[PDB]
């Protein structure tokens, strides 16, 4: 018996952006989805292409874990076909996602009096991402037709801070996403339920 | 690309960024509105200063996109409300000196305190002075003393300040390419581009006299019934056929007809409806009160209230350990975040309260998904009359049997319904008048009518015609009755009550024939409507993204301020006027004592 690190990817101290968002590869373990459920206020739970009761019984190559925070109204756009600044410029999942969608409000942990602003957004891009993308690029888009040089008029930094604080409304709470994505490749099947 | 596109990004970057700054800043006014305390004084001085810098930077970058290649009305109106420069148009000392006579015309209001005559040692200021006095006080010569030494200790001092500021004003109106300051307060009601619901600024006056000659004979009824009440108790002072006295208005201005009361009861043998005793019986506290405010929200279709509401609002005064004003206010701080403060007892007209104040929550919860510029009211009444229907669907007979209150057993006879019907007419019809005199007398100094040697004059002779209050001391011009009121010392409008006054009644006979209400609007309850409901929230959703015109169609069906509902809830008291007044005089002459 191999436990999967599915603890270090949901009980982690610090999550990372959404444009920023850590890809973890799970590979030769087990995958004990029941320990998922220790987080009891799951705000949703919605798998795409795949059932939760026969996750434990399919086994897959490689499973991608994708981690981030999102505010509460955001997490509706963690979605096949969504759109949206998050599944645009940010986060997008293909039209033929297979996995599911782990999400729980955290605002005990990512909130903080005069705002938590350790956490950003990309609102500004040339084009929407593709599925699976990702883009840490700082440079300051050109909305205007000048040259962009310096911030100013017309020229905006395309990331924007959150600023978690805990007296905020249910959808402006901070909350920590979890995508796993089930491969299965052309390699044997390394990762299976407990048996 | 084109300007719209950089438009919508610039006002996008400006709606991220306001959103955290307008909620530190309203977080910094909460914490010291529910705790008085020098530290948090300084916190919301240096968050106002940091809101205030950031709206004046963002303004000066919002000049470059030109309103005329804009075809979006959302970002047209958005880039319009930016754009405003306000007295940043004004030279640094022309907008230090209004800013000092603005100050200093607020502090001679807030500061300014009557002394006796026989006993300069004995003063009284203002809220516990002078209004308790007018309140409750029905001696001749004291309210006399009181109403004169009000306006002649604080008036004949604004006046050197308040001329400036109508000059300054106006020099900072027509510098934001308007007629005069009376054009600026009307863009609010000012629809432009959208087709068939256009409104223009002067149309307001129009409406607002058309409105009035309607209400006209109403107010005339009521005004021949009040005088008549006041000279069957104040013998040898008031006349059949003149106006009333300033001072004997049961106010300080004359604006709220609601202390007269006592005096001008129908049926005094018959107490009116005072639920007080059966919540004192039944234990109720302020949590109580807001359930059943909440209940009665959700009954007609709108979402319950949040748990940040619960946890973060002050339902109760906190005692003697923390300083807080207690004045019911509806606090929307962005973000998810509602609250409110109130210092809630046991007592019906606080209920009614917390209805009217958890209507303007569930307004502003409605309007949240709408951008930063456009999370308001479509106008600046908007919001008193949601809260206005709220608190008479609220204290209706039928609501308090239906809650528990009222026995069950509870008859509602005809009198005990006319008895309510003047009171809601003393409270309503009787400020409508007086806020049309204020408005117009301030519209037309501003526009130059009244330069500088006839205000109070013109104000005297307005009032007389409009309200028929007549002057018991003859004021001469270094005098200035306007200046007096709160409202026009601190620079805010006042045809905002006018029109929530009309937009209330349009509500609640639009809302109570989406209910179906067979009988009396009086008696009309929303409760337990979910058509009602869903045909309100069809324009609290709204905010300012559309024009007032098409959110009044939405619920009534019109365009336009409507009087015939107020008419149509007054209905069976004007009857019950008519005959009163059939053995007596009706109307006012402008001729009498000095």
């Not at chain 1, 220790?38 to 897959?60: E, I, Q, R």
Request: with cysteine; glycine share 6%.
């Amino acid at each position: 018996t191999n436990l999967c690190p599915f603890h270090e990817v949901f009980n982690a101290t610090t999550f990372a952006s959404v444009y920023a968002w850590n890809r973890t590869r799970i590979s030769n373990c087990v995958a004990d989805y029941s320990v998922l459920y220790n987080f009891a206020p799951f705000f949703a739970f919605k798998c795409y292409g795949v059932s939760p009761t026969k996750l434990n019984d399919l086994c897959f190559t490689n499973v991608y874990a994708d981690s981030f925070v999102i505010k509460g109204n955001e997490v509706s756009q963690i979605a096949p076909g969504q759109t949206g600044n998050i599944a645009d410029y940010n986060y997008k999942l293909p039209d033929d996602f297979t996995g599911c969608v782990i999400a729980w409000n955290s605002n005990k942990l990512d909130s903080k009096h005069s705002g938590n602003y350790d956490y950003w957004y990309r609102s500004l891009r040339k084009s929407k991402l593709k599925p699976f993308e990702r883009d840490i690029s700082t440079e300051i888009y050109q909305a205007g037709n000048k040259p962009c040089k310096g911030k100013g008029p017309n020229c905006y930094f395309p990331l924007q801070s959150y600023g978690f604080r805990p007296t905020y409304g249910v959808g402006h709470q901070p909350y920590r996403v979890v995508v796993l994505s089930f491969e299965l490749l052309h390699a044997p099947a390394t990762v299976c339920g407990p048996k | 690309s084109t300007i719209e596109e950089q438009a919508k990004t610039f006002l996008d970057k400006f709606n991220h960024e306001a959103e955290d700054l307008f909620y530190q800043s309203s977080l910094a006014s909460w914490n010291y509105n529910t705790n008085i305390t020098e530290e948090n004084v300084q916190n919301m001085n240096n968050a106002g200063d940091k809101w205030s810098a950031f709206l004046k930077e963002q303004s000066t970058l919002a000049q470059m996109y030109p309103l005329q290649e804009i075809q979006n009305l959302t970002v047209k109106l958005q880039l319009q409300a930016l754009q405003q420069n306000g007295s940043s148009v004004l030279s640094e000392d022309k907008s230090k000196r209004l800013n000092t006579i603005l100050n200093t015309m607020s502090t001679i209001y807030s500061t300014g305190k009557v002394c006796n005559p026989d006993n300069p040692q004995e003063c009284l200021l203002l809220e516990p002075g002078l209004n308790e006095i007018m309140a409750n006080s029905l001696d001749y010569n004291e309210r006399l003393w009181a109403w004169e030494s009000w306006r002649s200790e604080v008036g004949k001092q604004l006046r050197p300040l308040y001329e400036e500021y109508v000059v300054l004003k106006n020099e900072m109106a027509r510098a934001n390419h308007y007629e005069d300051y009376g054009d600026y307060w009307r863009g609010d009601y000012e629809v432009n581009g959208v087709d068939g619901y256009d409104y223009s600024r002067g149309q307001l006056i129009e409406d607002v006299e058309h409105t009035f000659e309607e209400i006209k004979p109403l107010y005339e009824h009521l005004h021949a019934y009040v005088r008549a009440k006041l000279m069957n108790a104040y013998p040898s002072y008031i006349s059949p056929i003149g106006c009333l006295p300033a001072h004997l208005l049961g106010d300080m201005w004359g604006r709220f007809w609601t202390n007269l009361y006592s005096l001008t009861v129908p049926f005094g043998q018959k107490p009116n409806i005072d639920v007080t005793d059966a919540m004192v019986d039944q234990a109720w506290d302020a949590q109580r009160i807001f359930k059943e405010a909440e209940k009665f929200f959700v009954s007609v279709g709108l979402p319950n209230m949040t748990q940040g509401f619960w946890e973060n609002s002050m339902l109760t005064d906190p005692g003697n350990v923390q300083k807080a004003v207690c004045h019911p206010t509806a606090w929307d701080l962005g973000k998810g975040d509602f609250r409110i403060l109130m210092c809630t007892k046991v007592t019906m007209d606080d209920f009614l309260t917390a209805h009217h104040e958890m209507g303007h929550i569930q307004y502003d919860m409605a309007y949240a998904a709408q951008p930063f510029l456009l999370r308001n009211g479509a106008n600046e009444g908007f919001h008193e009359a949601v809260g206005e229907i709220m608190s008479l669907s609220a204290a209706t007979p039928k609501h308090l049997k239906s809650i528990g209150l009222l026995s069950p057993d509870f008859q509602e006879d005809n009198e005990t319904e006319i008895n309510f019907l003047l009171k809601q007419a003393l409270t309503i019809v009787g400020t409508l008048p007086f806020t049309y005199m204020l408005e117009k007398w301030r519209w037309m100094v501003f526009k130059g009518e009244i330069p500088k040697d006839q205000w109070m004059k013109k104000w005297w002779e307005m009032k007389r015609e409009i309200v028929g209050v007549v002057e018991p001391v003859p004021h001469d011009e270094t005098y200035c009755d306007p200046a007096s009121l709160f409202h026009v010392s601190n620079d805010y409008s006042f045809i905002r009550y006018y029109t929530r006054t009309l937009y209330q009644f349009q509500f609640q006979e639009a809302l109570c024939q989406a209910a179906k209400h067979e009988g009396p609007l009086h008696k009309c309850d929303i409760s337990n409507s979910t058509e009602a409901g869903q045909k309100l929230f069809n324009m609290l959703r709204l905010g300012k993204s559309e024009p007032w015109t098409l959110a009044l169609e939405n619920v009534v069906g019109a365009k336009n301020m409507n009087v015939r509902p107020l008419l149509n809830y007054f209905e069976p008291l004007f009857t019950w006027l008519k005959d009163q007044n059939k053995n007596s005089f009706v109307g006012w002459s402008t001729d009498w004592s000095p």
